[PDB]
Symmetry: D2
Subunit: 263 residues, 4 copies
């Protein structure tokens, strides 16, 4: 089955930033034809730690920008919703509706996404055990969702730290396709006080682990200049490094693939 | 004065609310030192299973809560799950409660603050104590003035919560602190035997109030059946924490 | 039953330091007659993080100093052992043989302590669940121990941090007398790199919690001048504060006592 | 070269060691790229229960280990639990193993280092990756030159261990890193289905070797019966990690 690579700037800082990243993702989609690329970017960071942090330019502007990306590059689109009413308007452009980690248990949000007929990707809550995602998938199926993904993005490990329990990949695979969030899994929640931290040096090794274990795709935030990002400046991958990372995981995936266990 | 937020987990029927309301009213008259607040959720919006009990809706809920405040003159508190709910809930709720999983949802916090009512934020199981400072700042920015932070356990491995009591003195630096005695012993995805022991710890450490779910027959509750406190045991526990508080308060550290 | 207060300098820095602390503990034992005091001090810090940290002046010197304390003040004595051969010589002076947290699973050490006929106090390993201490007590009883204590000293919570799960007090009470370690429970393992850290501001509130929940005693390291201690300088309680802390926990214990659950 | 430490958890009988030794010898000849080390404990000194299997003693153990090295010419490794054991164990053990619970016991580390042999320290479930720097320093101070640090999981709530793979690159800054594939999936006080998946992760991330407990019939093992790898599956797993390593090594980060 075609491997999924969900990538793009964390937040829709501007329609320009989106077209700049979209151009590169389009180039890579032409090179890595065995990969199904999905362009991602949030129209709103509705859960920043500080009230003073960047959130976005609203849904209207965001959907418009995302539609421009899909229109210009013919790339699939995914973005996250935060309240039920957003599912309908977002579904007009998003091929995959993403459910934020903190909201993975909000029944009405999951149901709102499911009835749009679009694919739904739920970030696994940092408080959730792998086996408890079975009910999350059940809610979605109940709500009409036919294409469901569960994304591993780390688990609460003491204060301001997340650990990735790779046992979660084969467990969740029992009831949904699994995506590994390579950039959020290394962030340090509220690590910088008014904002979260992160250790970029661990992004690559952990993503290698993910494909070695076996997953159906990877999620990576990428920005031309991470140091200047308005969100997740410590974890967003420099855009020029994307190509090399993807080649590497496809290589590791291939050699490890024959050993992937059957669920 | 010391706050005691109590009531049935879910509004299974205004009839149930009135029964629990009668007992809380009685205790209210017996313990004038304490400020009681009746609590009950009009919707369990985050159940693990799609087939579990959620409730009878916001309208039926706000109505039942109205009956309690009118019939007993008790302050009210219930939780909201989406921004639009803040306004209609504020009609009856003296304190608007923010769910633990939603403690970082900026719009929900702002919506609650904008109603002018008091806001009680359940500290997320993923949050460090010091990270609640920013939560308070959001509410203040939104015009909130009576702000509470509730300790309800922290993620400890899978399907388990631990109460780090160091959180009480830490959160007290920027808000009044409430200890959730019933959800702190619950096992995500709980043991009633630990409710009283940990509540005693909370008052010995020092907090501004306690939160307890109580039901005439917990075994038959449609929500938190394993942790809801039997109504008949509420008086004894309140008297107990008041006595412990009286002696221990002498040692509560300043700010 | 008489409440136990185990207190003293973390390490036997000198026989003088011991007599200075012993004098105060003796004074308090005369005041708090409802308390059973036990003077504690390690003849060896066998598990310091750094090879450059203070360990002690050897068993011989240590036992001699401890015997002087017992001789001069008539105070009961407790100290910890690290290898089986130490149980015999230590048992000559120690009324209670303490088993280090990291060694709570070492069968031969527990057995060595048990056959001396002395009381045995096992620090609960930071890796151990409360219910798993049942087997620890079983080993001791098997080895002849008649007076057994289990000490709560925190549990691993993420990196370089410990949390106290007070549910452990009533659980462990099912099979042994329970002691709360008020000073080690707030230490930050390897927090200072070459040494462990700690937050003294939390010692008092957590000890109040312990007696409110209910335990059979408390363990506190105290030093005339903590800032100058050769070990646990960040967590040892200033000696002048001991009296007040003890009065407070006896007061809280008394008012909470009628609510202690029966096991 | 890549290290593969394997063998039965406990020395249930030198007869068992010889059987496992024969297979490890065969693989040894098949994979010249790998340096195999036969492992087996002469004593399980930290069992939870007093009634569990410990072993046949140090003498019977060192004797059986001698038979394996002589009969197959395989390097040896076993763990010590008290200082006095270092010297006699060093007679046969090429690598002296330090138990996880004992990774901070200074005298045990010094005793092992003093024998001149290589020392492999199991990282305690309570240790942070960066805290192993001091462990290495102790061994160096003691005269050790071939030092290994083994990843075997970290305490995650109660009765559970999680493998934080960030530890591999971190510990590599001051020592060769070995991944314990069998104890990392064990549940303190485990699931065999996760052994292979996590070992693949370890080599994809980058390590200097793997540690695996293998037994002809794990179901009948007197120790770690739920996690010991069936002997017949060892060849397949080794071939698998060699292939993954070959491709992934290209991306291992420097130091
Ligand atoms: O959903 C949350 C995102 O993944 C981040 O971890 C989030 O936006 C980080 O927020 P902050 O830096 O404001 O803590
Ligand atoms: O047994 C260990 C003691 O309680 C300490 O936590 C220990 O001696 C601290 O050692 P260090 O400061 O050298 O890490």
């Amino acid at each position: 089955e075609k491997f999924l690579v969900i990538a793009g700037p964390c937040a829709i800082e501007s329609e320009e930033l989106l077209l700049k990243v979209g151009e590169e993702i389009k180039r890579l989609s032409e090179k890595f034809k065995e990969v199904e690329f999905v362009f991602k970017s949030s129209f709103d960071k509705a859960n920043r730690s500080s009230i003073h942090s960047f959130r976005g330019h609203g849904l209207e502007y965001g959907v418009k920008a995302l539609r421009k990306v899909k229109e210009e590059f013919g790339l699939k689109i995914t973005t996250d919703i935060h309240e039920s009413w957003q599912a309908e308007p977002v579904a007009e452009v998003a091929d995959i509706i993403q459910i934020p980690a903190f909201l993975c248990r909000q029944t009405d949000l999951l149901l709102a996404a499911a009835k749009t007929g679009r694919a739904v990707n739920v970030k696994k809550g940092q408080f959730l055990a792998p086996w408890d995602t079975k009910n999350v998938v059940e809610k979605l199926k109940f709500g009409g969702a036919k294409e469901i993904y569960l994304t591993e993005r780390g688990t609460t490990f003491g204060y301001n730290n997340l650990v990735v329990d790779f046992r979660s990949l084969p467990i969740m695979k029992q009831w949904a396709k699994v995506i590994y969030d390579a950039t959020h899994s290394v962030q340090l929640p509220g690590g910088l006080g008014d904002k979260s931290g992160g250790m970029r040096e661990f992004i690559f090794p952990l993503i290698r682990a993910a494909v070695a274990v076996g997953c159906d795709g990877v999620f990576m935030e990428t920005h031309p200049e991470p140091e200047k990002a308005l969100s997740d400046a410590s974890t967003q991958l420099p855009l020029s490094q994307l190509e090399g990372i993807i080649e590497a995981i496809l290589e590791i995936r291939e050699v490890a693939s024959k050993y992937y266990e059957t669920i």
